[PDB]
Amino acid sequence: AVPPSLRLPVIEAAFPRQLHPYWPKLQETTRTWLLEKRLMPADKVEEYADGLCYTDLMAGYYLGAPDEVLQAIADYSAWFHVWDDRHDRDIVHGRAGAWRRLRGLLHTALDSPGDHLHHEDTLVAGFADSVRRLYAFLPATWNARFARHFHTVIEAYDREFHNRTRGIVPGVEEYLELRRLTFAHWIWTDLLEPSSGCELPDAVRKHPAYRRAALLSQEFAAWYNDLCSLPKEIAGDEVHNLGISLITHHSLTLEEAIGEVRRRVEECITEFLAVERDALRFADELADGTVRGKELSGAVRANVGNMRNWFSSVYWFHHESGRYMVDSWDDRSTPPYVNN
Ligand SMILES: O=P(O)(O)C(O)(Cc1cccnc1)P(=O)(O)O
Ligand SMILES: [Mg+2]
Ligand SMILES: [Mg+2]
Ligand SMILES: [Mg+2]
């Protein structure tokens, strides 16, 4: 059961949880990858990795993915959380040069991941390994789109670095725009496509019903993370959180801000329910009697189904993962799974 302040009865009643059959092997294989790529200290991997639930988060989302696609996605997701931790620690310790150099290497590795598979920075080498595998599933046009999206994500992380080093809390609207980039909304959306085995043409994925369903799934995930990660973020001097923007710029108390974030999250669900109908009608229209139409219809339907699964996977992840359990830590500002 979930605490009342975080509970979403519509998720519990109407978004039943799903789990990909590869999850048990996924859990161990990603743990071993974190150890072998030296992305976290060995003792922290053994003590904390399974409890962080990163593989569970992906296995509740990309249902139907081939096992090797899911493995690359899960390794990438675990990497992404470690990168968020590295960025945080570079900020806390004032390592502006180390951050700048990492940022530059990630831009280069994103365009040429094979060149960086054995880089001396293990964080760069692990990024490159996951991305090179992601680049092997679909035509290079998809790879180029993933790269365009992730270049933007890296720069949003750089903006967060600047904000936190200057002590700036973004305004609410500025924050909502930035959050689509720091949460990597378009990366998770891109990854729907190798999971269903089809690169969608621009005309299909830019259809208004597809686009809006994709957006709402990610807005829910990011803002629900803001709701659940607010305690650890306040304790860690993080400034990027819708609740923090509301407290800072709209003069809300903590209780009022929690209520407002909750209401915005709830609205994503019922807006998604409306647009999902339109997205599934579009999927039906794509089934025009042709083979290609059947393929595109099935891919769109699978992708919209996984946009729905993201809601339940993110919901339960936030109650299971050790990442957010700040009340258990000796130092609330320093999670035990980060290298400090
Ligand atoms: O777990 P966290 O740190 O609350 C977070 O969700 C980590 C994260 C980063 C990017 C994508 N998904 C999760 P963040 O975005 O930093 O608020
Ligand atoms: Mg974070
Ligand atoms: Mg972050
Ligand atoms: Mg957060």
Side-chain angles (χ1 to χ4, degrees), residues 1-6 8-24 26-45 48-119 121-158 160-161 163-165 167-176 178-210 212-249 252-253 256-266 268-280 282-293 296-340:
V2 174
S5 66
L6 307 174
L8 296 172
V10 176
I11 298 307
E12 295 179 357
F15 289 72
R17 211 187 176 161
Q18 321 277 327
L19 188 67
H20 194 292
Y22 183 67
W23 178 74
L26 189 74
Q27 182 189 53
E28 181 171 324
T29 303
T30 297
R31 188 175 75 245
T32 295
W33 186 77
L34 290 171
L35 183 68
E36 292 181 348
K37 298 294 180 185
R38 299 183 301 298
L39 292 171
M40 289 171 17
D43 64 331
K44 294 191 183 319
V45 170
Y48 300 122
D50 286 0
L52 291 167
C53 296
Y54 304 147
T55 64
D56 311 51
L57 178 66
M58 292 296 100
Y61 183 14
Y62 295 110
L63 280 293
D67 299 342
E68 70 165 353
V69 173
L70 193 61
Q71 191 63 65
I73 292 176
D75 295 349
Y76 174 79
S77 172
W79 176 88
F80 207 137
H81 290 83
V82 174
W83 181 48
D84 193 70
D85 296 343
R86 165 78 73 88
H87 173 253
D88 177 76
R89 291 296 100 172
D90 284 346
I91 293 165
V92 165
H93 296 294
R95 299 189 296 238
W99 168 253
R100 179 180 45 75
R101 288 188 285 277
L102 172 65
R103 169 191 176 209
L105 285 168
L106 291 175
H107 281 291
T108 305
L110 177 66
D111 292 327
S112 300
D115 297 3
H116 294 77
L117 294 174
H118 302 276
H119 198 275
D121 186 335
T122 60
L123 193 61
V124 175
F127 177 73
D129 182 64
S130 70
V131 171
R132 193 210 60 82
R133 286 184 278 145
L134 291 173
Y135 283 2
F137 299 129
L138 291 179
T141 42
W142 184 91
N143 302 348
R145 164 163 45 105
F146 180 102
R148 175 168 50 87
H149 288 158
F150 198 74
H151 285 294
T152 303
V153 173
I154 296 162
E155 288 306 291
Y157 269 65
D158 196 62
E160 286 184 315
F161 193 102
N163 287 340
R164 288 173 60 184
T165 63
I168 294 171
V169 178
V172 171
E173 300 302 324
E174 174 194 350
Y175 173 73
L176 294 172
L178 177 65
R179 184 49 162 161
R180 302 176 183 122
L181 312 179
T182 63
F183 194 75
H185 285 26
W186 313 126
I187 294 294
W188 312 116
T189 304
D190 291 337
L191 289 170
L192 296 163
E193 295 170 46
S195 296
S196 55
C198 180
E199 183 187 357
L200 294 182
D202 289 335
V204 173
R205 64 187 193 83
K206 298 183 175 200
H207 184 284
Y210 191 95
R212 179 61 61 88
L215 171 63
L216 291 164
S217 177
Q218 300 303 329
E219 299 286 56
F220 173 86
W223 302 348
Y224 195 68
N225 170 265
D226 289 3
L227 185 64
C228 296
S229 67
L230 188 62
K232 71 143 189 121
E233 287 177 0
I234 290 167
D237 299 312
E238 171 66 84
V239 305
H240 300 102
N241 184 302
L242 180 55
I244 298 178
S245 291
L246 285 164
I247 294 164
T248 302
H249 296 288
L252 303 191
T253 68
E256 291 165 337
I258 290 167
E260 177 66 22
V261 176
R262 262 191 70 81
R263 289 189 294 275
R264 294 168 180 239
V265 167
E266 290 168 339
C268 289
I269 307 168
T270 52
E271 289 191 29
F272 179 86
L273 291 173
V275 72
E276 179 182 43
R277 295 201 304 180
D278 292 315
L280 299 173
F282 175 48
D284 295 350
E285 291 174 337
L286 288 167
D288 56 10
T290 70
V291 168
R292 173 64 162 172
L296 292 176
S297 176
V300 170
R301 195 177 306 271
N303 295 358
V304 172
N306 289 337
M307 295 176 193
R308 152 177 283 274
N309 289 331
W310 197 205
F311 284 81
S312 58
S313 194
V314 164
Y315 183 76
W316 294 109
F317 165 82
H318 281 87
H319 312 299
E320 296 171 340
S321 175
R323 186 165 174 87
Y324 306 105
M325 299 185 173
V326 59
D327 288 355
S328 71
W329 302 342
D330 283 318
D331 173 3
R332 292 171 60 87
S333 77
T334 303
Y337 50 80
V338 310
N339 179 347
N340 193 41

